[PDB]
Structures are given as C-alpha cells and as structure tokens.
Design an enzyme around this catalytic site. Structure first.
Site, short mmCIF file in Angstrom:
data_model
loop_
_atom_site.label_atom_id
_atom_site.label_comp_id
_atom_site.label_asym_id
_atom_site.label_seq_id
_atom_site.Cartn_x
_atom_site.Cartn_y
_atom_site.Cartn_z
CE1 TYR B 31 16.13 33.20 39.33
CE2 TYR B 31 14.25 31.93 38.52
CZ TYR B 31 15.17 32.95 38.36
OH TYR B 31 15.12 33.71 37.21
CE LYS B 145 16.38 29.86 36.40
NZ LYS B 145 16.18 30.63 35.15
CD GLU B 177 20.79 35.93 29.68
OE1 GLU B 177 20.49 34.73 29.52
OE2 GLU B 177 21.29 36.35 30.73
CG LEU B 201 20.63 31.48 33.42
CD1 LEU B 201 19.20 31.02 33.29
CD2 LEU B 201 21.50 30.32 33.83
C1 LIG Z 1 18.03 35.60 32.00
C2 LIG Z 1 17.48 34.27 31.56
N1 LIG Z 1 18.12 33.67 30.53
C3 LIG Z 1 17.62 32.50 30.08
C4 LIG Z 1 16.48 31.89 30.62
C5 LIG Z 1 15.97 30.62 30.01
O1 LIG Z 1 16.35 29.55 30.87
P1 LIG Z 1 15.54 28.23 30.79
O2 LIG Z 1 15.43 27.81 29.35
O3 LIG Z 1 16.26 27.20 31.56
O4 LIG Z 1 14.19 28.47 31.37
C6 LIG Z 1 15.86 32.46 31.73
C7 LIG Z 1 14.69 31.74 32.39
N2 LIG Z 1 14.14 32.42 33.52
C8 LIG Z 1 12.94 32.18 34.07
C9 LIG Z 1 11.89 31.16 33.66
O5 LIG Z 1 10.72 31.56 34.36
N3 LIG Z 1 11.11 32.43 35.41
C10 LIG Z 1 12.34 32.89 35.22
O6 LIG Z 1 12.91 33.78 35.84
C11 LIG Z 1 16.39 33.68 32.21
O7 LIG Z 1 15.89 34.32 33.33
#
Ligand SMILES: Cc1ncc(COP(=O)(O)O)c(CNC2CONC2=O)c1O
Ligand SMILES: Cc1ncc(COP(=O)(O)O)c(CNC2CONC2=O)c1O
Lengths: 277, 277
Positions: B31, B145, B177, B201
């Site tokens: 996603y 992701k 993270e 990620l």
């Molecule tokens: C585990 C993880 N690491 C890093 C990020 C940051 O990635 P981005 O900078 O590209 O957003 C996310 C964003 N996850 C999201 C954002 O909103 N919903 C989610 O599950 C995340 O789930």
C-alpha cells in the site's frame, strides 16, 4: 453454500467485507482450521481453545462464549452438508476508520467462517513427499496464529516452484517448522522436534503426535536440530490439520536414509489412525 | 464519497470485498499514502514508483501503467473535493480459493483507494512529542510496504497506552524506525539515520529530508545508532507522509537534551516547507 458471518448463517453471496476491516488493512486478526471426518469435527475443543488464546495474545475480545462458538460451528457443518474436509474461521478486530492503534472498544469483531470438501491426502501419507529448506524471515511471534502470513506464502511458493510439497524453514540453519506445518525427525527410535516457544506455532497435530509417541513408549526430546542434522536423520515428517502425518523422503535432491517411509513413522501413523472419528 | 475500485471511481456503497481476497486472509498486498495540500498531491510519482517496487518484491503485477494510476488518483481527488488530507491506496494479489501458494495467473489484483480530510499536525510540529522504546519483533523484509502490519499496530498501541505519540523500534539494541515513521538523530550538526536495508522502509519523507539536508549544507551519515546513543543525541525527530517532520523531545521520561525543539530540526522544517504545494 453458507458462510458464518458473526452469529448468523447466510448464503455466501450476502457476505461483504468493508474496506476498513482491520483484517484487510493490517492483517489484524487470528484464525483456525478444523478437519472434519465424515461429519465429525476432529479435536474441535483444542482448536477453539487456541483461537481464543491467539485472540487474547493480540487483545481481541471475542463476543461469544466457547459454547456458543461451538454451536455455531456445528450449525455451519450441518447446513453445508460437509462430509470430509475442513472448516476455516477467522476473527478480526473489526471495522473502524484507519489508524494503527486500537479503535474504541465498541467496534465489534468481525467473524467469518466457511467450509470446503477435501479428502485426506492418502497418496502423500503412503509414498512421502519432497521438501526444501527456506530461510525463515517471519516475525518473532510465531506462537500467535494470526493473519500476517506473507512470509509463509512466499516460502510455500518457492517450494511449489521447485516441485516440492513443503518448505522447511530455518533460522541460522536451526530448523523451526514448515510454511504450514510442524517438523519432526527420528534418529535411533527417538523423536525430535523444536520446542514450543515464540519461534513456532504449537500445532494441534504436533501435540497429538507427541501423545501418540508417549502411548507407544517412544521417547521424545523437544530439542532443536539443524538442517545438516536433519539430513542425517533416519526418518523425517511434517504435521498439520490438513496434511496429518506426511513423511518427507527427500530434501533438495538428497534422500532421507533410503528414501522410504521409516519404521517409526508408520507406528505413529497407525497410532494416530485410532484417534480419527 | 467515492472510492477507487480497480480501474473505476465508484460510490463507496458499490464496493464489495470478497472473504477470500488474499489481502483479507494472508495480508498479501502492498500500500501507499499520499498527502494532499489544498487540492495538490505531494510527491505523487515517488509514492507510485514505490508502490510498484513493493508489489514487484512480492511478485504482484499491477495491470495499469504508472500514468493511468496517476490520472486515477487525480480523478479521485477531484471527485471527493479533497482540500487537505491524504489518499490511501492498496493492491492485493486478488481473490482465489484459500491456498498459501500464488493462484493461477488468471486472477486479477484488487485495487482500493480513497480519501480523508485531515489537517496538518500543527501542535505536534511546533511543540514536539513524547516517544517510547519498543523491541522490534517484525519480519525481516521491512523494506516492503506490505499489509502485514500486526507488529506495528501492537507497538503503536503500546505507545498510546503510555501516553506517547510514537513507538521507536529497536532490533537488538539498534534503533531501526518507528511503528509508522522513520527516525533521525542529530549530534554536532550531523544528521544520522539507519541505512535503507531490509530492516527499514525507505520513506519518501525520509528521502526528502535528506534532500533538504544537502541543500542547507548539512552532513548526512547513514549509520545505525543504539538506544543508548539515541538518548545522547542533541535532537531527535520522526518522519512520515502524515507527520511530516515531528520533533521527539522525550523518550520514556528522559528528555532529549533540554526538551525543546532543536535548531537543526527547525531549519529542516523550514526547508521542507518550501517544497509543499
Ligand atoms: C514503518 C514505516 N516506516 C516509515 C514510514 C514513513 O514512510 P513515508 O515517509 O513514505 O510516509 C512509514 C509510513 N507509514 C504510513 C503513513 O501513513 N500510514 C502508514 O501506514 C511506515 O509505516
Ligand atoms: C506455520 C504453521 N505451523 C504449524 C501448523 C500446523 O498446525 P496444526 O497442526 O494445528 O494444523 C500450521 C497450520 N496452518 C494451517 C492449516 O491449514 N491452513 C493453515 O494456514 C502453520 O500454518
């Protein structure tokens, strides 16, 4: 056929999942599979016990008692006229606007259950199957039977592409379990298998096999073995609700002993047979 | 409102999800989340490239070209009259009778996308938040992701119950993270963050913040740091499409320096601001 939707029995067509069901967006739920032999559910109390145990581990409160859930399963079998096969049922945390944290304890869990006709894999039990070693990359809470099964699907696919029936998973060369089963090894009349901790799923079949071993006076050691030690075993087999006791006679082109089902694997299968309805 | 369903923008009431959709039974999908500012999508192409990469890593073939997916999200934004909020879109392997291995190539993936009005986190961006350390127990392919997010929901929940905003994950004492964000640390005017391997990620906001650092002459070192080293940092902050650059001023009752948003975080927020539509 008919599906179990919460506490109702409905035609398959009437069932629809919401896009914000937490089981669809986060894999936030747990499940079970129960084998039915000629209308009778095998070890149904144990599977129900484990479903409630799994749910509790991730803090999901199932709204019905074990007695009600049991009656529900019976109704689902009778309505679908299931002879031999299995019942699949799962519980997710529910539908709620997307957010990682838990909703507001109002969201009622969503329960889905259905049946499928499927005969025993008799040919595999008799001749044995081929397997392959695949690195275990799953998360560290394998004791929870959750819907987060992407690691297992990728391992199963790697197995199926190589013409093998099951992927035997290992972490740093220490064998854990199969992508959808538990793994056992026999050396000098002794049964070996990975102990039940966060590294594996405490299979119901696995437990029935250990009971069968104690019954025929075969000693059991819940001690971990390596991929190399597995190849040095006299006999090897995997267990699951659907596979029962399936012998592994070859792994990656290397035969286990002579490549025939062993003496003790047959004694266990025979003892197992006495418990089937 | 309207929901993107495969290749059509339909009314939400018309969307129907099957119980055997692999996203519901195996969390077999990937996603994305794109932020929208006053009707304009932020870093669309970057998020689309990543969706296709994520799907590619688990062998899912998205039937449309990246150009068609983009015009579709644009349409989705127009129809819903979205001002400031985000678009959520996911791709699952499809619907097929339950089995761990991949279905036959005849089954088409299911694509779901929708919008939500959600303002920028003003209070958090200005005052900073409290975080908490939680052991990283997720699988070993965190670079994908996927919908297998149970580890993240349990971590985020732990954080919320403690009164914290984010859970900072660590695998064997090394900070990886956050449950839904990337973690950055600053010491002596130098920016530190865990490298982009299978352990994290590679966030879009993360890369943007690294583009912002180079633009303001700030040295960046992609070297991992431990929990003990994080607490000795001058500044700490998390990044994500929805949190943007949120300053972390405390972790488990331990203030990060003086407990105020640091100098370099502000400069980074100021530079980031110049990229917003
Ligand atoms: C585990 C993880 N690491 C890093 C990020 C940051 O990635 P981005 O900078 O590209 O957003 C996310 C964003 N996850 C999201 C954002 O909103 N919903 C989610 O599950 C995340 O789930
Ligand atoms: C990873 C894993 N370990 C062990 C087992 C064996 O447990 P039981 O003996 O209780 O069946 C299973 C069963 N998994 C199943 C059974 O059918 N489909 C599944 O996902 C499993 O997925």
């Amino acid at each position: 056929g008919y599906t179990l939707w919460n506490d109702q029995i409905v035609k398959d067509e009437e069932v629809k999942i919401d896009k914000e069901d937490r089981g669809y967006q986060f894999g936030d739920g747990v499940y079970e599979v129960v084998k039915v032999y000629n209308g009778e559910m095998f070890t149904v109390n144990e599977h129900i016990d484990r479903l409630y145990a799994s749910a509790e581990k991730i803090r999901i409160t199932i709204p019905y008692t074990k007695d009600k859930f049991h009656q529900l399963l019976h109704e689902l079998v009778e309505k679908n006229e299931l002879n031999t096969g299995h019942i699949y049922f799962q519980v997710t945390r529910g539908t709620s606007p997307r957010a990682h944290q838990f909703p507001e304890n109002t969201v009622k869990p969503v329960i889905i259950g259905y049946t499928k006709e499927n005969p025993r894999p008799l040919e595999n039990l008799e001749k044995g199957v081929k397997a392959t070693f695949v690195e275990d990359i799953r998360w560290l809470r394998c004791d929870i039977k959750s819907l987060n099964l992407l690691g297992a699907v990728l391992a199963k696919q790697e197995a199926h592409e190589k013409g093998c029936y099951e992927a035997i998973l290992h972490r740093n060369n220490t064998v854990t379990e199969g992508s959808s089963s538990n793994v056992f090894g026999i050396k000098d009349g002794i049964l070996y298998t990975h102990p039940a901790n966060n590294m594996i799923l405490k299979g119901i079949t696995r437990d029935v096999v250990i009971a069968c071993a104690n019954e025929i006076n075969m000693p059991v050691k819940e001690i971990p073995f390596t991929t190399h030690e597995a190849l040095k075993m006299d006999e090897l087999f995997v267990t699951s609700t659907t596979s029962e006791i399936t012998p592994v006679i070859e792994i990656d082109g290397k035969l286990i002993r002579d490549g025939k089902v062993g003496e003790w694997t047959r004694k266990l299968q025979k003892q197992f047979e006495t418990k089937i309805p």
